[PDB]
């Protein structure tokens, strides 16, 4: 046709909302920190916690030329997410969000950030995988994986699909060596539904408030046809003087119900426990020597990292 194949439509929709994040410090050293994403017209901006964690004074630069001092609304180390706030006049670009879009492996995506302070850069790849634990097994970021080139400075930037809709917040690039070689096209972004959820918690509270039981657990499954089986979360480690220990939960207990909900998936149960208001007293049914026990647990707040 008369028009070359292009993703310029997604750039025009989404790129104006992606900012360059700087620190202003000491004569005057303006040090580039990463990128960020303007999420709503109020001026709330999402970035990674590791982008701003060292900043004396956070400067936010827009593609249209406007520069702002940003306030740190809050951060969360378990998801490496941080929310900034600017006070702008005359309107702000915002990143497109489709709360109903499901990211699919193979979707074309664009990475938008400020690598090596070259200025805002658009790179293209695809969604490589989902549910990726990442490089650090925090297991609470639920990374999307992409081969859209991610470099130092892309952190906190946006990963969008061909319609400019936000897929995730680019966070990490793979650089671990097996035999002295350099990996290529392996980068991770926090999915946008998690980014949105943590943002609202950071805006409303000083940070993310998480219920906590103090168990290290993993999902199980039987062993060949499946017979006799039991489903749930097996307790691998109990943090001492934690809620689970004080309640009598022992190693190799099989959690089958948490707060009147069946414990089917580790992640679902993990997320549910986070949403329990600290101090709550909840039931926890476990299987111990093929007998059910109901333990009364007093939820604590997640310990500080």
């Amino acid at each position: 046709g008369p028009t070359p194949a292009s993703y310029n439509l997604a750039v025009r929709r989404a790129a104006p909302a992606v900012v360059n994040v700087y620190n202003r410090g000491l004569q005057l050293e303006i040090r580039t920190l990463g990128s960020g994403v303007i999420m709503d017209q109020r001026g709330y901006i999402i970035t990674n916690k590791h982008v701003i964690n060292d900043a004396d004074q956070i400067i936010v630069a827009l593609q249209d030329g406007r520069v702002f001092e940003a306030l740190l609304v809050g951060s969360d180390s378990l998801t490496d997410l941080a929310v900034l706030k600017i006070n702008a006049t005359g309107g702000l670009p915002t990143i497109p969000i489709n709360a109903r879009r499901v990211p699919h492996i193979g979707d074309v995506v664009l990475a938008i950030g400020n690598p090596y302070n070259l200025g805002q850069t658009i790179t293209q790849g695809i969604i490589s995988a989902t549910g990726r634990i990442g490089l650090n097994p925090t297991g609470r970021q639920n990374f999307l994986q992409t081969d859209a080139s991610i470099n130092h400075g892309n952190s906190g930037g946006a990963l969008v699909n061909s319609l400019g809709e936000l897929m995730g917040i680019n966070t990490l690039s793979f650089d671990k060596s097996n035999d002295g070689e350099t990996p290529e096209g392996i980068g991770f972004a926090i999915p946008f539904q998690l980014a949105t959820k943590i943002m609202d918690k950071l805006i409303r509270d000083g940070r993310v408030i998480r219920g906590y039981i103090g168990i290290g657990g993993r999902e199980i499954a039987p062993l060949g046809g499946g017979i006799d089986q039991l489903q749930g979360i097996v307790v691998n480690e109990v943090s001492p003087d934690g809620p689970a220990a004080n309640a009598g939960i022992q190693v190799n207990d099989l959690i089958i119900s948490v707060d009147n909900k069946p414990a089917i998936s580790a992640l679902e149960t993990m997320d549910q426990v986070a949403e329990i208001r600290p101090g709550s007293v909840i039931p926890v049914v476990v299987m111990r020597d093929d007998k059910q026990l109901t333990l009364q647990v007093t939820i604590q707040e997640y310990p500080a990292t």
């Binding site: 297991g139 906590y212 168990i215 657990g217 691998n236 943090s239 992640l267 986070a274």
Partner: peptide, 5 residues
């Protein structure tokens, strides 16, 4: 594959 929560 241990989840701490």
């Amino acid at each position: 594959l241990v989840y701490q929560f």
